[PDB]
From Swiss-Prot:
The lineage of its organism: Eukaryota, Metazoa, Spiralia, Lophotrochozoa, Mollusca. It is found in: Secreted. Negative results: does not affect (up to 50 uM) the Nav1.7/SCN9A channel, Drosophila Shaker channel and rat KCa1.1/KCNMA1 channel expressed in HEK293 cell, as well as on whole cell current of neurons from neonatal rat hippocampus and prefrontal cortex. In addition, no detectable effect is observed on either action potential amplitude and duration or Na(+) and Ca(2+) current amplitude and kinetics when im23a is tested on action potentials and depolarization-activated Na(+) and Ca(2+) currents in rat DRG neurons. Keywords: Cleavage on pair of basic residues, Disulfide bond, Neurotoxin, Secreted, Signal, Toxin. One of its GO terms (cellular component) is extracellular region. One of its GO terms (molecular function) is toxin activity. Expressed by the venom duct. This is Conotoxin im23a. Belongs to the conotoxin K superfamily.
Amino acid sequence: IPYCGQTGAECYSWCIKQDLSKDWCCDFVKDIRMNPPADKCP
């Protein structure tokens, strides 16, 4: 588990700790050229 982590799913858990919005992270971990999972953001 390096900086953000390995994949996007795992990182999707940190961005939320910011308490901004469910779409806030969906657009963040997805903008980091990562591979977000399909079971987190519809």
